[PDB]
Amino acid sequence: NKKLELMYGSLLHDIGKIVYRSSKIGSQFLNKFKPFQLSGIVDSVSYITYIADNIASGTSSQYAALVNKMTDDLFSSLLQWTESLWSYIPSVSLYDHSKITCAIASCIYDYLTEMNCVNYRKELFSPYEKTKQFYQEDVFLLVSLDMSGIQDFIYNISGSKALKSLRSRSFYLETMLESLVDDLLSDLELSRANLLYTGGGHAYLLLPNTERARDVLASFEGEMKEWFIKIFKTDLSVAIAYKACTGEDLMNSNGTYSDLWQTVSRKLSDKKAHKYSLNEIKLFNSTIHAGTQECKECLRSDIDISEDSLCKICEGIIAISNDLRDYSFFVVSPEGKVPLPRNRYLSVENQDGAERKIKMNKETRIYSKNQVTNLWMCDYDFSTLNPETKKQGIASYVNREVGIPRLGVLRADIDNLGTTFIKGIPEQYRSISRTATLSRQLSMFFKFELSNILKGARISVIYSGGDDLFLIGAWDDVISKALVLRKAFTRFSAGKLTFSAGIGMYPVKYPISKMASETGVLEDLAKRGEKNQVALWNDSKVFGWSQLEEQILKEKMIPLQEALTNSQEHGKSFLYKMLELLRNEDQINIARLAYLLARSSLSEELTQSIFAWSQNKQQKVELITAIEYLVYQIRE
Amino acid sequence: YSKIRIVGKIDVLTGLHIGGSMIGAIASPVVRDPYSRLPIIPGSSIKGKMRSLLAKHIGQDAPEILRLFGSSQKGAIQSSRLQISDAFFSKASQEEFDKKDLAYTETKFENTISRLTAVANPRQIERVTRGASFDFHIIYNVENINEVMADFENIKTAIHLLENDYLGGGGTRGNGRIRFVIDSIDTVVGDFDSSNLSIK
Amino acid sequence: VVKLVKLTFKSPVHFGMKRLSDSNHTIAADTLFSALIIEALQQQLELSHLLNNLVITDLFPYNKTSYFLPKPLIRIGYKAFKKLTYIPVENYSEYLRGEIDSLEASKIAESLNLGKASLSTKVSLQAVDHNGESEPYSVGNFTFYPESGLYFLAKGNADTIGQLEILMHALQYSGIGGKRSAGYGQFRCTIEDSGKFDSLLSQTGNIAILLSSAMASDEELVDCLEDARYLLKKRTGFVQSKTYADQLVKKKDFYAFSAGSTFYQKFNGKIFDVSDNGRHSVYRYAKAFWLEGKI
């Protein structure tokens, strides 16, 4: 267990530094715990780990409480524990550094095993120049595996079960991507520390440059190609590309690091051009029987189709969609609802079912939803808060005593997310830890914080993520939460990050697919120009988030709302009359509005403010929108 | 095989609402060409209305109906002889409506009075303005030389039934009344003699 | 004898890709070939010319300003380059040489104005008379701008060219795409000699770009794939005829290299048979039309 103790030591090497804040005192603290004390761990804490730490590098009461907690608890479980405890403490946080050290160590150990060095310490630290030279030997591999077919797979649906299918497909694709890397890690005897981060549909990892690891990567790519051709044919694919690098490259010397990842993305594009070999292409071509029926969702005929015009995969997806929202545990097991890469299936189960299945068969992989590897996903659904509301679903949202009963679909995309992942970090601070932390924070806000932001609102999140966000909710709630989210996103990012969204209002009976398509167009309007600005209800209404929140919903809607309620002489009909003049846009209506305002007897400052707003083109669109929002709110 | 072209005009005798948002705004719009925004009559609405009227007259499932308007029945796969295209707001109607600044489509304000509370509920619908003309195009495929005449008679009957009926929309309340003016009936493909054929 | 065939559409076209709700702005060469065969069978002409000497191209977007060919799959802001799908004939050499920049690619994408896509919501009232209900369904259509049109290039001997002229004139009344005979796909077509394309085609470049959606024979496939950048497009659908079977039958699933795919070694195509035990053979064009370019 030299590798095991090495990995444990590298993660625990800076445990002493936290004790100091409350290398030697860390080992002394570790000595208190017997399994951690024995063999390599304490020696690594006291002092491959040192070389890995070098490559990585290139109130007391609170600390004391952290130390007490750490003693109370004291490898995957250890890595999950370490991350929660060290996430918000300085070393890049401590976890980030510890994980990166562990990964680098594991890679170095595998490389040294491949080279079969007689004495690692002496070969590395004797001349004292071999430390510098070892940063020049090609020892690491930057590996990227990307899944092709994400959006098409989620939206290759008929509307019949769309709401369900859209939530299930996005979860299935992310869960499948997790399984992939886990399988790869299982093929390398590595841990999650070696995967720097996972993008939705993407996975970046750091691997040893050993011949065994290279052959493992080639075999895994071949097996994944075969499995994806056997299950989804050309609907989904996976491309894996690796690039060799040295310690200096990981240490951002000469600025090559940000280049090298690009080279990996240069190879990935070459894995998607010549995606299929001739034998696979011939196999796709060589159909024998055309088939007598097809699935209404996949539109495939080779696979056996049930009596409900559903293939087994789509039927599984639709069945698993309620479970992913209801049950936290995800179980990669021999028996389960939807197929996974290696002769396994993904079943969503509770804690009792997860324990039953993992003790039943040894090869069961368990993932925990928002809590066994932990996966982060947003499944906020107000309808599930009550049983009858759960039965109603979307219909429960439009059950309003007051306000128009309409569903509001928020489809959103973080602006320049790719620019943020390409040049969002200055070349001065370009490094592995930060690029992993920035992605992890973005994932956490979308997968974890999003549930707290939306808490208390009648909103159901179809899917999350910085790539694409889809929520269906009551319209007044969807707008308010969309504004809350923009303010939170700027705070979370401390600025420099903007989110563009399209908001649409639809009757509950109206089809989800149509809601998704129309709202996609609204999001597109906002995205093409004025990317920070949101588009609400119509193509005509595109507004900056601050404009929508204050210059419309605060400066204009609130006065009008308080005025109408106070006035016994006014009503929706007066507001409709005002709207008709504003909508016509004739110069005479400006004059006719003034006559109506004088007759109306509304407070003078409001009277003048309305008059001024009508004359300004920007204010009038806000005045129209503010009146329309008020009419939707006032209407029973 | 022969193809016979029937090019003509549809005159709107009462406002037409083929159909196919903001509060206090028309609640039902009409079908309009996306680039030109002109109102159009879909080639499926005319085909369906003619088929339904011919079914009511004949009776659907009759062989004449299936051969005129196509059928996908098991063992009775028949191509539709009648290929009715979308009718476009005519250039002449555009010129006349542009003079006098007449809008192509007019909003109609209606309401329903409840039998319980006697409370009116307002609706606004868009109807193509009366006096509008659509250039309608029809193609007949001569699958059988011996059934052309009867088919044309059927066509005539349907058109006659349509002239005393309405096109798509709330036509039982005064909407969609139309008139057909058959400009030509010409053979575009083949040597078939279609001079004697008549729709009206 | 390469003849340009420009199509002007009077009514919107459907051009379904997988479902009736969706729509494409163009159609594959096979979809056009299937329409040409169906027409020839109606007009009682010999299919030997079409099946043995006719070479066609996928219908490509055309504008009064320019004629657009498919974007070649050649390694070169990656978003701007990926968003681009069609390049004008004059800018094709510039794109191949790499002289194009991301902003220029954005301008090229903005340059095309093929048309405005839409979704028409129709209803079926067939069950209303039987105590049933109206059934809403959606047809995705695409309306070309008045200057904008779809063109295709057809190559062959004089006999097949004249047969193509006859079939094309009958086809305009027949229409193309889905929901034809229900209001869509009526087009008027011109066949002319094009100086631009024939000059463009008379180039012997180091790379070959597939004008039509095409697939190589098994023996052709082994040489062709080496160093090929390409996009396998599934070609699937139902059989449209009155005599194939009593009920509607799906064709055998076929995979073809997409237009704009670049192969170092040229492969001739083949009219494959996607029929499965029917009263006639359902032909699927997969022949190859090649634009040789220099990179």
Tokens (6 digits) for A6: 């090495």
From the list C120, C170, C246, the residue facing B75 with the nearest CB is C246
Q: Which helix (H) or strand (E) holds C292?
A: strand C290-293
Listed in order, strand segments (DSSP E) in A334-400 are 338-339, 345-349, 365-369, 373-375
Q: How far is B46 from chain C (nearest CA, A)?
A: 9
Phi-psi region of A289 (alpha: psi -120 to 50; beta: other; left: phi over 0): beta
Which residue reads 């209506």 in tokens? A589
Instruction: Indicate yes or no: CB of B188 within 8 angstroms of CB of C12.
Output: no
Instruction: Indicate yes or no: CB of B23 within 8 angstroms of CB of A632.
Output: yes
Instruction: Indicate yes or no: CB of C250 within 8 angstroms of CB of A291.
Output: yes
Distance of CA A162 to the CA centre of its chain: 21
C246 touches A at CB < 8 Å: no
CA closest to A630 among chain B residues:
B23
Chain B neighbors (3+ CB pairs < 8 Å): A, C
| Cα dihedral across residues A146, A151, A157, A162: positive or negative | positive
Phi-psi region of A537 (alpha: psi -120 to 50; beta: other; left: phi over 0): left
Interface test with chain A among C207, C234, C249, C273, by most A beta carbons within 10 Å = C234
Q: Which chain B residues touch C11 with a CB distance below 8 Å?
A: 43, 85-86, 88
Interface test with chain B among A521, A585, A628, A636, by most B beta carbons within 10 Å = A628
SS3 A57: helix
A545 touches B at CB < 8 Å: no
B21 touches A at CB < 8 Å: yes
Within 107-136 of C, beta carbons closer than 8 Å to A belong to 119
Report the candidate in A477, A482, A582 with the shortest Cα–Cα distance to residue A533: A482
Report the candidate in C150, C149, C166 with the shortest Cα–Cα distance to residue C50: C166
SS3 C98: coil
Contact C268, C248 (CB under 8 A): no
Contact A239, A143 (CB under 8 A): no
Contact C123, C136 (CB under 8 A): yes
- Secondary structure letter of residue A593 according to DSSP: H
Q: Which chain A residues touch B25 with a CB distance below 8 Å?
A: 583
DSSP codes joined into one string, B131-200: T-EEEEEEEEEES-GGGHHHHHHHHHHHHHHHHTSB-SSSGGGS--BEEEEEEEEEEEESS---SS----
Chain C neighbors (3+ CB pairs < 8 Å): A, B
Contact A592, A578 (CB under 8 A): no
Resolution limit, Å: 2.7
Instruction: Indicate yes or no: CB of C252 within 8 angstroms of CB of A513.
Output: no
Question: What approach was used to elucidate this structure?
Answer: cryo-EM
Give Dmax (Cα) for chain C.
Answer: 67
SS (H, E, C) C169-213: HHHHHHCCCCCCCCCCCCEEEEEECCHHHHHHHCCCCCEEEECCC
- Phi, psi values for residue C7, rounded to 5°: -110, 130
| Integer Cα distance of B65 and C109 in angstroms | 47
Angle between helices A617-634 and A572-584 (to 10 degrees): 150
Exposed/middle/buried for C166, CB within 10 Å: 0-12, 13-18, 19+?
middle
Tokens (6 digits) for C188: 């008027």
| Integer Cα distance of C167 and C180 in angstroms | 17
Contact A501, A408 (CB under 8 A): no
Q: Which chain B residues touch C14 with a CB distance below 8 Å?
A: none
DSSP codes joined into one string, A563-604: HHHH-SS--HHHHHHHHHHHHH--HHHHHHHHHHHHHHT--H
CA closest to B23 among chain A residues:
A628
Tokens (6 digits) for A377: 């996903």
Interface test with chain A among C22, C83, C221, C239, by most A beta carbons within 10 Å = C221
Interface test with chain B among C181, C242, C244, by most B beta carbons within 10 Å = C181
Position B46, amino acid: I
From the list C145, C182, C248, the residue facing B47 with the nearest CB is C182
Distance of CA B20 to the CA centre of its chain: 14
- Phi, psi values for residue A536, rounded to 5°: -120, 125
